[PDB]
Amino acid sequence: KTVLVIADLGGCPPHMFYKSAAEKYNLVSFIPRPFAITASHAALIEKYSVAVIKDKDYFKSLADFEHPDSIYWAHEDHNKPEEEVVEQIVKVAEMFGADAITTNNELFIAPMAKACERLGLRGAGVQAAENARDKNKMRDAFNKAGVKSIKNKRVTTLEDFRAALEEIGTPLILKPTYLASSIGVTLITDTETAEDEFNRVNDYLKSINVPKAVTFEAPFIAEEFLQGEYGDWYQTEGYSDYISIEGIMADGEYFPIAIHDKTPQIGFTETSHITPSILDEEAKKKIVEAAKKANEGLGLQNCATHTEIKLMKNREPGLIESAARFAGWNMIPNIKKVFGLDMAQLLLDVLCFGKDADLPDGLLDQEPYYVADCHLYPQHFKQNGQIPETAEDLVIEAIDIPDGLLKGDTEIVSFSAAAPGTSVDLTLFEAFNSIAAFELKGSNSQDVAESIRQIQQHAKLTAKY
Amino acid sequence: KTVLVIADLGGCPPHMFYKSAAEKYNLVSFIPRPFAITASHAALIEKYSVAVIKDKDYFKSLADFEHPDSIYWAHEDHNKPEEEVVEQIVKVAEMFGADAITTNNELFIAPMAKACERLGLRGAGVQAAENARDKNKMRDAFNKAGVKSIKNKRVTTLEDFRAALEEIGTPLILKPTYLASSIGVTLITDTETAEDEFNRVNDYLKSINVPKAVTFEAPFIAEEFLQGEYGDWYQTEGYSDYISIEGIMADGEYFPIAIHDKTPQIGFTETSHITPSILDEEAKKKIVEAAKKANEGLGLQNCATHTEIKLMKNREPGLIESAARFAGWNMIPNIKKVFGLDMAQLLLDVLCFGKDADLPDGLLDQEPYYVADCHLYPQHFKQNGQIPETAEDLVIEAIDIPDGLLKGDTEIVSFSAAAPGTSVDLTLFEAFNSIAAFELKGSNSQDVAESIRQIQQHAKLTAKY
Ligand SMILES: Nc1ncnc2c1ncn2[C@@H]1O[C@H](COP(=O)(O)OP(=O)(O)O)[C@@H](O)[C@H]1O
Ligand SMILES: Nc1ncnc2c1ncn2[C@@H]1O[C@H](COP(=O)(O)OP(=O)(O)O)[C@@H](O)[C@H]1O
Ligand SMILES: [Mg+2]
Ligand SMILES: [Mg+2]
Ligand SMILES: [Mg+2]
Ligand SMILES: [Mg+2]
């Protein structure tokens, strides 16, 4: 079978996805945004694809041919309307006799579903992909699905925002409807300053570059803040009052795979993911039921899902959002590390063979140990005081982890820092700015989690200011 | 315009060809032999092609995806008949709306010409490409063309060889009809040992891996040795009694570009190429006339040509062979370095626009200096005595050029050696075995040539035996 991948940023990381897919399938890669592709990613695409096509419109001089080492967000214009992007995807699938189409990138999810319908291939479903990609549509589907409902309003104007804040009250979440990675996600607690907070992220949002293929009913959604009740869920310290759960939709039925515990965010910037959750079986049953109702509520047919859930009072699961694609960072690789299951291969098996794929009957269990996937940010060193608080730029020499910081049998499997010499702008939104990553493993989850907090508070930044 | 390149070994090197082509054209690359592609070559193909297709039949496990750092000859099977290879090329050109097809590899020249005819694109010409690829057909075309003629016979059997040696006498050249790089090329001078010499290279030839797409009337050609008369041509020492000349056929007319001087071969293994020739204008007029008659005699329509010519008594040019593709090593890059002319771009301009291309009217001149492209071989150190004569293997630590060795204003532009640690088998045919490469430049050609001989005799090999 031949699988077409729409290659771009995010989701199951290139270091796993290409090799995984090429094991069992003939992979063809379509690159709609050549500029979104790093040098490492380009190498992996080249290595494992039997065929590769790039959008030739995004090559005007010989330097369009350059691949950066690192990309946190694609800044260049992509100006094709969604119908045109659909027609491209279709043309490429047809060129290669594709039996399935997949993507790891949030921004191409809606057009891909349209391409699959037109080709008679398995996909998210046209309206379902739109629901999984416009947070106002999504929140409407959730409210209808008999998970916990909350108040939410479409916001374009200061007038819209004013109305929303009056109707919803504080605390209020205001966020863009069409992005990812917590971009623009703001917590409103003060009616005195709320309107300035809006004006500010409004102006910010307009500086974010997205393809014209991305459309939305209103730029913002304002909705109730879902309050966490940590102590109603976790028995030990170390985690946060949200989780994610990774699943697969197959013919419109939800198949849970694994739940990830989290460490506390820096604002809304995510910090760490632990595979699998320490939560008891009843807690996990409730999360699974919520994710099922949410994703079936969206109408999704065949895709991976990454579903985020706030752990609220009375063990009520609150839906934050759900995507029709893989979790990012190393969450999917780490499921393979722990359980032996390759969810990338499993998705492709579903796209090609439906419920003939070997879907697990329930969450994976009998984990031999826990694995943490962790990023450090300028803020861990601002909060450490190693970076002076008022600094807009810095130059990175080294990042070191002092010894002694590990609890129990917790092991550091790997550690990677930003190269000596690297330049960091501190006006930047944090989630774009991890300057180190580490993987921990341990037999005891609470020990793993404590070690993450120790590594976080004590890591050593040597840096020219 | 869209150019399809059949990507494989030899010709205009990847470090020039892809970037050159992608400057002015939309490049699509077809890889019929994934195993023939080095890691550097793969990277260049990926960087400059808007689309890439590989033959998926040559991928059975995840390690078919590996690219070696270095390949001297493709060892793996390629089992498709020529008609099947033609049909592939056609299918790919049709997929991408190719306006032209080119290749740098000798072994795909015949099928490509067939694909171009069928598609109505410019090419070598079907029978002309066959003549440029079967040395018995080639030598027959040459004899007909009114360049100097010589005796030649088709050899398959010991009986055939015996007959050929009687009819031709010594000295005799016996060589495979369908290869390159002097593989199997043998000089016969002794009727006592001639039949054993045949039996030996017969058995050797059968161990050389070529695609099934390569066919030939007889495996061997035996033909008169063309005697050189150096002193009838060159006024100074430093060169050899053969040259090459690089040209372009456009609509069946020959356009000379540049003549390369050579340093003496190690047997028939080539050693160095100097851009451009020091030969006087009359000598160059005779070479050009010979190359014209030869390549027009072959019937070639639209292609690059690399034509090798023995400098014989009475300034008679002897045809050695001619290919319907670029010279290998850095001969084509070095023409650009000296004259500013990019022959890769010029070939593509001819394939797409015919004689509307900006073809020079005669050999390029007003060279600002001479550039030498030079390889060192185990033999330069065997002959130096730095490698003991009876050694079948070695391990390379370093290769050094002592200072003092440069004549006049000759400069070393660049120097590259085999990595410390590299392993070298000395049973191997020499042309496969360069362990260092250097580029010289100088204002005075005879000084450049002398410096090459000094570097050759005195270079320092540090090596574990
Ligand atoms: N209604 C909400 N209540 C509480 N937290 C929220 C809410 N909406 C978003 N968040 C927080 O902001 C983060 C990012 O918002 P999310 O809706 O997941 O958008 P994104 O697609 O940018 O990741 C979430 O992981 C969650 O911590
Ligand atoms: N008839 C010949 N007379 C003299 N030298 C020859 C003859 N044939 C081949 N050679 C020598 O052998 C080398 C390689 O042979 P050639 O015919 O060019 O085949 P290849 O395609 O292997 O390079 C030539 O560069 C030339 O030096
Ligand atoms: Mg999201
Ligand atoms: Mg999210
Ligand atoms: Mg040859
Ligand atoms: Mg030759």
Curated annotation (Swiss-Prot), chains A, B:
One Pfam short name: ATP-grasp_4
Positions bound to substrate: 270, 306-308, 325-328
Pathway(s) of this molecule: Antibiotic biosynthesis; bacilysin biosynthesis
Catalytic activity entry: L-anticapsin + L-alanine + ATP = bacilysin + ADP + phosphate + H(+)
SUPFAM superfamilies xrefs: Glutathione synthetase ATP-binding domain-like
GO biological process terms, semicolon-separated: antibiotic biosynthetic process
Entry binding sites for ATP: 135, 175, 181-182, 223-226, 265
Effect of residue 106 to A: Loss of ligase activity
Mutagenesis or variant effect for residue 325 to K: Loss of ligase activity
EC number(s) on file: 6.3.2.49
Record's keyword annotation contains Transcription regulation: no
Induction: The compound guanosine 5'-diphosphate 3'-diphosphate (ppGpp) is essential for the transcription of the bacABCDE operon and GTP regulates the transcription of both this operon and ywfH via the CodY-mediated regulation system.
Consequence the record notes for mutating residue 270 to A: Loss of ligase activity
Subunit and partners: Monomer or homodimer.
Function: Part of the bacABCDEFG operon responsible for the biosynthesis of bacilysin, an irreversible inactivator of the glutaminase domain of glucosamine synthetase. Catalyzes the formation of alpha-dipeptides from various L-amino acids in the presence of ATP. In vivo catalyzes the ligation of L-alanine and L-anticapsin (epoxycyclohexanonyl-Ala) to produce the final bacilysin antibiotic (L-Ala-L-4S-cyclohexenonyl-Ala dipeptide).
Name of protein: Alanine--anticapsin ligase
Species in which this protein is naturally found: Bacillus subtilis (strain 168)
